[PDB]
Amino acid sequence: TITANVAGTKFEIVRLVIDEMGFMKTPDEDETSNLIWCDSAVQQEKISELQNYQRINHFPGMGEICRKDFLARNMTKMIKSRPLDYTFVPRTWIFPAEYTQFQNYVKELKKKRKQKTFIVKPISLIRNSQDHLIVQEYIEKPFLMEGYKFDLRIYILVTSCDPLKIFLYHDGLVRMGTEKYIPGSKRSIKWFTEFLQANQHDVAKFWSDISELVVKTLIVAEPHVLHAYRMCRPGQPPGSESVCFEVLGFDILLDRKLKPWLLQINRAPSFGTDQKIDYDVKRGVLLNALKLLNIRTMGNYRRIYPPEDKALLEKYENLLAVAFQTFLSGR
């Protein structure tokens, strides 16, 4: 029947959900399983060994948008081509590569008598070495919740890279700060939207900005993923359904003007469940994801690609044309 291999997971909610969908757990050494779940990223050879009926929870080449240094370099090549479309990414400087370039930006800022804050990630701040770090402009005026800075963790389901299909879960995690903000309690996004409603903010625009952010982010990753997949899977017929799917964890910060900024993409987000908020959300994320796969022999998900809007789809396909063009230039 429909079987599963949960040897590569350490989270009970993953096993719980898979057991709840009706999957029969195979012994760990069994590679025949219809579904193969692994927490961390998989070797490309493992994806190449799959059969066309099998489904694994990771795309090959997704590290181009998950690794903060790769994400910075690729987005940079994209900003230079399409700056108006990609404004959701704070300026980032990869070290020890863009050291001199970063110093020049500080030089101009000094002469202009202006000041900016900068965050250093693997974490500390700076107001202006040969180590592998990254420098990023610091969003100084974040959206505060009762005087508190918070983080958004949204969950993205990518079911295919050919044709590209992207789903956005309309719920997630909110990580409020410990001490109040000046220039960790957990909550749900569903609750945060109800907050925005009571405080009269456009919840629809919030989701729309988030959706466009994700698609345009995956658009940057698409040429990397598509090539890796096709070289990993040379035995797939022209219209063969995707062997790979993936649940990505987007870390996102909103500024005072409720503009969503991309911080990182986690291809291996913790599905741990110590609290009830973690349970309901993450179970719903995993359960509905397997539902959409429809493994044979949506719920709180909304398809953001391909969009029902024709005009928006045209813009996306234009960006994809640029993404693939930018892709060939680098390699």
Ligand X SMILES: Nc1ncnc2c1ncn2[C@@H]1O[C@H](COP(=O)(O)OP(=O)(O)O)[C@@H](O)[C@H]1O
77, 326 contact by CB (below 8 A)? yes
Three-class DSSP category at 254: strand
Query: Contact between 223 and ligand X (CB under 6 A)?
Result: no
Query: Contact between 136 and ligand X (CB under 6 A)?
Result: yes
Q: Which one of residues 16, 21, 119, 292 is an interface residue with ligand X (CB under 6 A)?
A: 119
Q: Which alpha helices (H) appear in 34-98, and where do they start and end?
A: 44-48, 63-66, 68-79
User: Measured at CB, which residue is nearest to ligand X?
Assistant: 139
The count of residues interacting with ligand X (CB under 6 A) is 11
| Nearest distance from C-beta of residue 217 to ligand X, angstroms | 15
Query: Contact between 123 and ligand X (CB under 6 A)?
Result: yes
Q: Which one of residues 138, 148, 195, 324 is an interface residue with ligand X (CB under 6 A)?
A: 138
- Those residues whose C-beta lies under 8 Å from the C-beta of residue 265, and which sit 6 or more positions away, are 65, 66, 71, 217, 248, 249, 250, 251
What is d(CA 91, CA 60) in angstroms, rounded to the nearest whole number? 27
| Nearest distance from C-beta of residue 41 to ligand X, angstroms | 16
What is d(CA 169, CA 187) in angstroms, rounded to the nearest whole number? 16
Bridge pairing between strands 164-176 and 150-161: antiparallel
Which residues from 5-64 bind ligand X, rule CB under 6 A?
none
- Those residues whose C-beta lies under 8 Å from the C-beta of residue 81, and which sit 6 or more positions away, are 322, 325, 326
Choose one: 39-47, 71-79, 116-124, 283-291; the region binding ligand X (CB under 6 A). 116-124
Nearer to ligand X, 164 or 174 (CB): 174
| Nearest distance from C-beta of residue 92 to ligand X, angstroms | 8
Choose one: 55-63, 134-142, 153-161, 201-209; the region binding ligand X (CB under 6 A). 134-142
For residue 83, cis peptide bond before it (omega within 30 degrees of 0): no
Query: Contact between 253 and ligand X (CB under 6 A)?
Result: yes
Q: Which one of residues 18, 72, 263, 265 is an interface residue with ligand X (CB under 6 A)?
A: 263
For the chain, count helices (H), then strands (E).
9, 14
Choose one: 9-17, 119-127, 215-223, 224-232; the region binding ligand X (CB under 6 A). 119-127
Nearer to ligand X, 253 or 313 (CB): 253
User: In 3-state terms, the chain is what percent helix, strand and coil (to 5)?
Assistant: 35, 25, 40
228, 61 contact by CB (below 8 A)? yes
Q: Which one of residues 61, 90, 223, 260 is an interface residue with ligand X (CB under 6 A)?
A: 90
Q: Read off the amino acid at residue 107.
A: K
Choose one: 18-26, 133-141, 192-200, 237-245; the region binding ligand X (CB under 6 A). 133-141
Buried b (16+ CB within 10 A) or exposed e, 173-186: bbebbeeeeeeeeb
| Nearest distance from C-beta of residue 118 to ligand X, angstroms | 8
Query: Contact between 148 and ligand X (CB under 6 A)?
Result: no
Query: Contact between 121 and ligand X (CB under 6 A)?
Result: yes
Give the binding site for ligand X (CB under 6 A).
Answer: 90, 119, 121, 123, 136, 138-139, 151, 253, 263-264
